[PDB]
């Protein structure tokens, strides 16, 4: 029942109207590295961005547009969201399921796994 909302200084609109997403970021499919998929992340909901009349630069009025926090575990991020009084949605971690890999299967006598080209 810890509430630091009064002490944080955040304006009420962002406290109440913002949904924070707790997730483990998915791996960038462009790369095979998995180091960036090992820590939970808390990210706020996206809001309007408009073009500046003078230069066309993307303008925003959302103070928490770029705010992202890293948490070791899901429970810690949930605790932080609850203490700060943000509505939270938790997406469970997605882990690559174990696979069976055989180089010999590429040259199977009877199975379809035989590879036409190496």
């Amino acid at each position: 029942k810890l509430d630091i909302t009064t002490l944080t200084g955040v304006p009420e609109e962002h406290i109440k109207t913002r949904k924070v997403r707790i997730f483990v970021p998915a791996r960038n499919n462009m790369q095979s590295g998995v180091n960036n998929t090992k820590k939970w992340k808390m990210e706020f909901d996206t809001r309007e961005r408009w073009e500046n009349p003078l230069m066309g630069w993307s303008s925003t009025a959302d103070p928490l547009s770029n705010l992202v926090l890293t948490f070791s575990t899901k429970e810690d991020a949930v605790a932080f969201a609850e203490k700060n009084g943000w509505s939270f949605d938790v997406e469970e971690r997605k882990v690559p399921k174990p696979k069976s890999k055989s180089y010999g299967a590429n040259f199977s006598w009877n199975k379809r796994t035989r590879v036409s080209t190496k």
Partner: protein
């Protein structure tokens, strides 16, 4: 019948037939790879997976070597690091200096694995090779001089797409990847070759030159083009959608998305 193997002295119980790379994954060590994709078949050509097994004279390819009980996988031994450095040097010997213009820059496995497991300088004092580019369609922009002959695209086209139209022609350093004829690689899953390719040899024509990886903001969402429900990552920069990238959901879409979604 789990058997016990040690990765850097740590006991890990793995089912028989598990490769050294997966055993290392069990302990958190991600063996550097260029040609190995879990979805695709094992090839062993890249040779960046080489690691040293304790009391074994010759390094083994982690991707293609099934673990044997009692093996201790030394993933950071001097031999393993030197093998990685040599393989990286060979990979970068003929690679074009196209990084500033390569779309894969900032998200290139060659760049990061060079910055992590490779030397910081070049001893190559000869001219580099160049390959005439192949046209495989209106979706995949091809700069084949950047190819590292990992054969990921060929194995993907054969195994997942089912189109046996991409292959290797020639031998030696002159070996080239692509249809021998002026054929066009047409499939629902053709765009996934762009994702699978470790280097920026195969890149999205629609997304060419538009943005760099670090700029983009990634939003996880679901596709609506089909009822499959493929999970996607919508990459947006400055409030504008830049590209759609597949997101891994083993149950619905493994790592792939259709051309219409992409």
């Amino acid at each position: 019948n789990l058997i016990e193997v040690f990765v850097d002295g740590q006991s890990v119980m793995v089912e028989p037939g598990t490769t050294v790379l997966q055993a290392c994954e069990k302990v958190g060590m991600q063996i550097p790879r260029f040609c190995y994709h879990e979805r695709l078949s094992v090839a062993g050509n890249c040779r960046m997976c080489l690691v040293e097994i304790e009391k074994a004279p010759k390094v083994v390819a982690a991707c293609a070597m099934p673990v044997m009980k009692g093996w201790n996988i030394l993933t950071n031994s001097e031999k393993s690091k030197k093998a990685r450095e040599g393989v990286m040097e060979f990979l970068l010997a003929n690679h074009p200096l196209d990084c500033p213009i390569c779309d894969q820059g900032g998200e290139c496995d060659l760049q990061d694995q060079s910055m992590m497991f490779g030397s910081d300088r070049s001893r190559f004092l000869e001219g580099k090779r160049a390959v005439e580019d192949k046209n495989i369609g209106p979706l995949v922009k091809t700069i084949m001089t950047r190819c590292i002959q990992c054969t990921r695209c060929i194995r993907f086209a054969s195994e997942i797409a089912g189109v046996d139209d991409l292959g290797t022609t020639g031998r030696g350093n002159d070996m080239q990847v692509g249809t021998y004829i002026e054929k066009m690689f047409m499939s629902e899953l053709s765009g996934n070759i762009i994702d699978i390719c470790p280097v920026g040899a195969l890149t999205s024509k629609p997304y060419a030159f538009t943005a760099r990886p670090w700029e983009t903001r990634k939003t996880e969402s679901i596709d609506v083009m089909d009822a499959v429900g493929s999970n996607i990552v919508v990459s947006t920069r400055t409030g504008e959608v830049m590209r759609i990238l597949p997101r891994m959901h083993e149950d619905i879409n493994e790592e792939w998305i259709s051309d219409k979604t992409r």
